[PDB]
Amino acid sequence: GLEAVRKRPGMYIGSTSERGLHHLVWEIVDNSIDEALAGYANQIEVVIEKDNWIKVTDNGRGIPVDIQEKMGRPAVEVILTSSVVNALSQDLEVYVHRNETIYHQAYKKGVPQFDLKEVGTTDKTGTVIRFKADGEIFTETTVYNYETLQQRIRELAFLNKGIQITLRDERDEENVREDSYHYE
Numbered sequence: 001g002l003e004a005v006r007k008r009p010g011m012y013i014g015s016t017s018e019r020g021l022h023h024l025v026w027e028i029v030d031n032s033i034d035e036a037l038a039g040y041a042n043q044i045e046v047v048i049e050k051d052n053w054i055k056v057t058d059n060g061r062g063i064p065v066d067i068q069e070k071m072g073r074p075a076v077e078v079i080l081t082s083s084v085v086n087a088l089s090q091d092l093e094v095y096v097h098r099n100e101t102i103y104h105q106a107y108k109k110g111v112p113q114f115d116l117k118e119v120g121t122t123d124k125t126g127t128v129i130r131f132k133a134d135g136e137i138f139t140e141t142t143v144y145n146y147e148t149l150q151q152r153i154r155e156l157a158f159l160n161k162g163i164q165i166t167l168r169d170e171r172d173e174e175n176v177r178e179d180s181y182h183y184e
């Protein structure tokens with residue numbers, strides 16, 4: 001299932017080049033866009049963090065955490081273990097703010113490192129996905145381009161007016177850059 005994504009990456013994302021690397025971001029952002037189109041999220045945040053980790057945050061309902069009829073595993077674990085981004089990431093973390101609780105799970109090459117755990121309390125709702133693209137899959141470059149992400153984030157904000165979409169570059173902690181889009 002998920003081992004097939006690691007052997008044929010291009011079959012799922014197109015290429016293991018700069019284009020494919022950026023497609024990973026788009027596959028996570030699209031989920032937050034779906035949550036905004038469903039009527040629950042109105043704020044999306046994309047962060048290029050240190051060592052080219054990507055953090056995508058929305059203020060939707062939070063990916064469901066309820067135990068399933070099929071697996072006996074939380075809905076979020078089922079969803080993430082079928083995720084191409086998760087399969088192609090050397091590391092991926094999830095934080096779900098839901099039911100006044102903060103739930104967390106980490107994966108390595110799509111494989112869960114521990115069971116979903118409650119790690120805090122919250123008055124907010126939403127999902128946080130942090131991932132570090134697998135450097136063995138992505139050989140050409142693992143370095144994100146700001147202008148490529150910005151150009152697309154601005155188009156998404158224009159296609160989904162009323163949704164606040166923010167892009168931040170934190171790779172240089174001494175010089176942080178931010179572009180926030182919010183069309184009326």
Ligand SMILES: CCNC(=O)Nc1nc2cc(-c3cncc(F)c3)cc(-c3ncccn3)c2[nH]1
Nearest residue numbers: 028031032035056057060061062063064127129
């Ligand atoms: C950072 C990436 N953001 C998300 O993945 N946001 C997100 N919010 C969700 C809410 C529901 C959701 C919550 N409550 C009730 C529902 F019916 C759906 C379901 C999903 C989901 N479902 C299938 C695949 C991927 N994501 C969400 N993703």
